[PDB]
Design a binder for this molecule. Structure first.
Ligand SMILES: *[C@@H]1O[C@H](CO)[C@@H](O)[C@H](O)[C@H]1NC(C)=O
Lengths: 46, 712, 46
């Protein structure tokens, strides 16, 4: 998406957009990176 | 805090603050529409919602553009004119096919105020494919010229338009394309209160007529109302009253289905369950629809359409154990109001699929069972995503399930017009379950004569008294006591009253020219002495140019008699069938009506017929009141026998049976009470009597049968 | 520092048939000198 202060309300609206489907808090377990695409194994904390 | 009104207006227009400055609505002068979006929401970030078009594109400045209609950027087998970079209001365009192509639909179409074109879609078909040319709706783009069996075609709308209906249609067995006809929609086209009510009933009532076959009708109505905070108490309370009239409307049909009221937000809330003993009580369901309030879902104003449909799933599900007695006989009608702007749960479509698998629909090539599930969607919220509300709504041929009225007031009028109006509910050419007797209309006629005689013919129940049949099966000498008619497979014989022959029937009016036989206007009605009680074995059949047939073809009430003849009997190789009797058992025989360019080939073969071997002009023995069938091209069509004479020539379309002809005479007799010829000649043709030619006679003799014949 | 026409308001061509104008016409106009004349108004392709 992007990167200038992204307040609380900023995330609320950007997370409740019709497009936004999934919202997780994950933990990067393992990084299997290659040449054409990089796998990012994340673990959904909640 | 209230969003700043800095640079948020619209060029050549205005806007107004609603919901206490939490949202604004652009107001463009008549003849123009707010661009891109109609209204805007006040984000909690201090700025209004970004200007997103239909292609999810960002717009800087809002402008008031004029109301234009979709441009036909794709048309085959013909030519349309004039052509312009854009079509204003009240602009007319005409269509014209090339040489060797037939034009069906409206030739002249005018751009209306609702940003749509008047009349139907113009299609130029040659009639060479198993299924008729799907055509290319104005604004769409069809990909696929092959119209064979199992073949498919894809559609694509222009940039900035939302495709409504099916994007892919497959030519299914029986001459019919799957899904519904596409239609490129914009962001201001909406639907007039009449267009909605007219397309809603024409798609609902038909799904109700079949239900009666057959307390507690075998049909469930799931009312899912959206109470999210993105709709507003204004468009919500109006949706409630909108449903209230719907229940009472269905009640006027003397039918008491099983209702299920469910209002959802962040979580579903079931008020009425189909398993309850009060689900059939229209009154109670209405009061429950009144007790509900928009304030019920204020604390948790979420939008999780997924869970909502899942709640409906649990209402139609089963322990299993059951396997219920009569689960495969129940129709389900899910009606839900929603802006389509879901954000919690994901794609609600996934649930719909689960419902299809639970009801075993579309999981059988021979038994689609698509008639056991209807999904109607209505846009209520200010910002309604036509893309989503379409993906949920069902796609049936010549039926509309997606609706978007102008405002809430109009949505109400849609259901007000219903309560007053009482469309004709007739069950002509209908089939019941399905021992084995799928031909209720079928009738067996026998005429006893001296020595033996036993003239063996057949007819077709067209009313509660009359039974259409051939005319040569009877004579002026034959009385009423010597004529017996049996229907529904009953062992007894019904006593007739009088046999009405056609005023122009004269089999012996050609002996001068050396023509022994002359089956011109070979039709006759048989008014019974007793009234027939319709059952699962006895039932009328649709006759051309009737208010009952108009609904069967799912055509608008404003359909003229001429339009039906173009639909039932096009200028091509029509696919019809007739009823034959083999070994005391009725059986269907699929044939083809030579009404295309193979018409002359099928007619001139009447010279090989007994007695017609010395006819000067073959066009004198084959009057325009004849429909030629049988032959080897395109396929080897089964021939009619002597006992099949007077049999109905039916055209199976839209799961309905329409009689268009009457078996008159055949060229070569292939039945001799022994075996079938098997070695039939390539000129063994069969002729019938076009009902569209004997309409004036049918309309007069059947004026007191409540068949509702068209004027014309 | 900009001009031209917006890339949004440019109706691109599309109709490029290899053959068209496959119709029929009948000369019933008042014959003069044994020569009938018909004035057709066709729309050229793109
Ligand atoms: C309906 O249910 C019964 C269950 O015994 C089944 O035998 C029958 O095949 C079903 N009918 C249809 C339409 O398949």
């Amino acid at each position: 998406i992007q990167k200038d202060k992204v307040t609380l309300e900023e995330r609320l609206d950007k997370a409740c957009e019709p497009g936004v489907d999934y919202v997780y808090k994950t933990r990067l377990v393992k990084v299997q990176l290659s040449n054409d695409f990089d796998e990012y194994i994340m673990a959904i904390e909640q | 805090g209230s969003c700043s009104l800095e640079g948020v207006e619209i060029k050549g227009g205005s806007f107004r603050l609603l919901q206490e400055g939490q949202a604004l609505e652009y107001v463009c002068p008549s003849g123009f529409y707010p661009y891109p979006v109609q209204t805007r929401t006040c984000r909690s970030t201090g700025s209004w919602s970004t200007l997103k078009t239909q292609d999810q594109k960002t717009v800087r400045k809002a402008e008031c553009r004029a109301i234009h209609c979709p441009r036909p950027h794709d048309f085959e087998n013909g030519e349309y004119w004039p052509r312009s970079p854009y079509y204003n209001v009240s602009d007319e365009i005409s269509f014209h096919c090339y040489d060797g192509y037939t034009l069906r639909g409206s030739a002249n179409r005018t751009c209306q105020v609702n940003g749509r074109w008047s009349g139907q879609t113009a299609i130029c078909d040659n009639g060479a494919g198993y299924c008729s040319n799907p055509g290319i709706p104005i604004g769409t783009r069809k990909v696929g010229s092959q119209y064979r069996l199992e073949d498919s075609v894809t559609y694509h709308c222009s940039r900035g338009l939302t495709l409504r209906g099916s994007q892919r249609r497959t030519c299914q067995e029986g001459g019919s394309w799957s899904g519904t006809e596409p239609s490129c929609q914009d962001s201001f086209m909406y639907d007039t209160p009449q267009e909605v009510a007219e397309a809603f009933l024409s798609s609902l009532t038909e799904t109700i007529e079949g239900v009666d076959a057959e307390p507690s009708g075998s049909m469930n109505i799931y009312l899912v109302l959206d109470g999210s905070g993105s709709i507003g108490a204004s468009d919500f309370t109006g949706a409630k009253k909108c449903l209230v009239n719907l229940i009472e409307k269905v009640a006027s049909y003397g039918v008491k289905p099983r209702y299920g009221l469910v209002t959802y937000a962040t979580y579903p809330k079931i008020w009425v369950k189909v398993s309850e003993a009060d689900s059939s009580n229209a009154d109670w369901v209405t009061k429950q629809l009144n007790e509900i309030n928009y304030e019920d879902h204020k604390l948790k104003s979420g939008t999780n359409t997924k869970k909502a449909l899942q709640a409906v799933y649990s209402m139609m599900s089963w322990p299993d154990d059951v396997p219920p007695e009569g689960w495969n006989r129940t129709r389900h009608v899910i009606i839900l109001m929603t802006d389509g702007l879901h954000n919690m749960g994901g794609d609600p479509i996934t649930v719909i699929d689960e419902i299809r698998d639970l009801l075993y629909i579309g999981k059988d090539r021979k038994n689609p069972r698509e008639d056991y599930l209807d999904v109607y969607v209505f846009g209520v919220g200010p910002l309604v995503n036509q893309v989503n509300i379409n993906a949920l709504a069902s796609k049936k041929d010549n039926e509309q399930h997606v609706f978007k009225v102008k405002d809430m007031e109009n949505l109400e009028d849609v259901f007000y017009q219903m309560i007053d109006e009482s469309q004709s509910l007739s069950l002509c050419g209908m089939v019941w379950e399905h021992d084995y007797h799928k031909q209720p209309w079928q009738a067996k006629i026998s005429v006893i004569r001296p020595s033996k005689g036993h003239e063996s013919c057949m007819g077709a129940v067209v009313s509660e008294y009359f039974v259409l049949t051939a005319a040569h099966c009877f004579t002026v000498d034959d009385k009423e006591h010597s004529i017996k008619v049996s229907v529904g497979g009953e062992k007894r014989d019904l006593e007739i009253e009088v046999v009405l022959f056609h005023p122009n029937y004269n089999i012996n009016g050609k002996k001068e020219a050396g023509i022994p036989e002359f089956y011109d206007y070979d039709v006759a009605l048989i008014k019974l002495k007793n009234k027939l009680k319709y059952g699962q074995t006895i039932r009328p059949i649709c006759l051309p140019c009737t208010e009952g047939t108009t609904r069967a073809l799912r055509l608008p009430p404003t359909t003229t008699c001429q339009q039906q003849k173009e639909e039932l009997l096009p200028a091509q190789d029509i696919k019809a069938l007739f009823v034959s009797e083999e070994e005391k058992k009725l059986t269907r025989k699929e044939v083809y009506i030579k009404n295309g360019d193979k018409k002359g080939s099928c007619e001139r073969d009447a010279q090989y017929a007994p007695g017609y071997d010395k006819v000067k002009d073959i066009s004198e023995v084959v009057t325009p009141r004849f429909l030629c069938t049988g032959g080897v091209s395109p396929y080897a069509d089964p021939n009619t026998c002597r006992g099949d004479s007077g049999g109905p020539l039916i055209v199976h379309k839209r799961s309905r049976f329409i009689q268009v002809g009457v078996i008159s005479w055949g060229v070569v007799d292939v039945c001799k009470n022994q075996k079938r010829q098997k070695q039939v000649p390539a000129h063994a043709r069969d002729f019938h009597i076009n009902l569209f030619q004997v309409l004036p006679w049918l309309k007069e003799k059947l004026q007191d049968e409540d068949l509702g014949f068209l004027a014309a | 520092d900009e001009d031209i026409i917006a890339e949004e308001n440019i109706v691109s061509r599309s109709e490029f048939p290899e053959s068209w104008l496959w119709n029929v016409e009948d000369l019933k106009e008042p014959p003069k000198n044994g020569i009938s004349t018909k004035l057709m108004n066709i729309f050229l392709k793109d």
